[PDB]
Amino acid sequence: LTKDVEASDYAASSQETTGEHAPVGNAFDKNANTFWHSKYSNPSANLPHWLAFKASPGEGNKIAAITHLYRQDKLNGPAKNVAVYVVAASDANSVADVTNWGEPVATAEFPYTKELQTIALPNTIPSGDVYVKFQINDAWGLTETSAGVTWAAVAELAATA
Ligand SMILES: [Ca+2]
Numbered sequence: 001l002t003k004d005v006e007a008s009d010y011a012a013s014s015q016e017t018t019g020e021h022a023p024v025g026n027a028f029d030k031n032a033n034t035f036w037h038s039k040y041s042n043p044s045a046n047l048p049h050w051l052a053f054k055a056s057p058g059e060g061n062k063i064a065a066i067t068h069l070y071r072q073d074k075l076n077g078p079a080k081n082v083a084v085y086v087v088a089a090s091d092a093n094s095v096a097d098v099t100n101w102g103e104p105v106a107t108a109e110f111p112y113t114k115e116l117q118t119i120a121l122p123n124t125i126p127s128g129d130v131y132v133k134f135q136i137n138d139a140w141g142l143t144e145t146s147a148g149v150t151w152a153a154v155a156e157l158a159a160t161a
Helices: none
Strands: 006-012 049-056 065-069 081-088 106-109 117-120 130-136 156-160
Touching (some): 065 130
Antiparallel strands (some): 006 049
């Protein structure tokens, strides 16, 4: 019932730890002020960028939604076109082991905003413990109409059940 789910075993396509302290862990710490950021220091990562983690909802429940909160400080090309993949935690030893994520169970286009975004998931996803990949295919520019940025940042990523 609209409640948050234990996350663990965090992974990212890339992360910045040189130019600033922005590891994947920043996206799961329940602090709006901290964010994961893609590696932009040289050699910089490119799109798509993603975060993944394990969601543990309890035995008799299923994750209903992924939530995304951008950084809150400024508008710096927030995520635009996103995709969520899901597999059963049994599918591998850890998040990082997962070699096939299947078809996106959900997509979303986010408005030009810092506000919290919710992506409801289909009930065809496995029950109980799941690995989740949140992937950013496209980003906003520095205005709505300028060319999209090549980097990504997320202050918080979470699953509800
Ligand atoms: Ca954070």
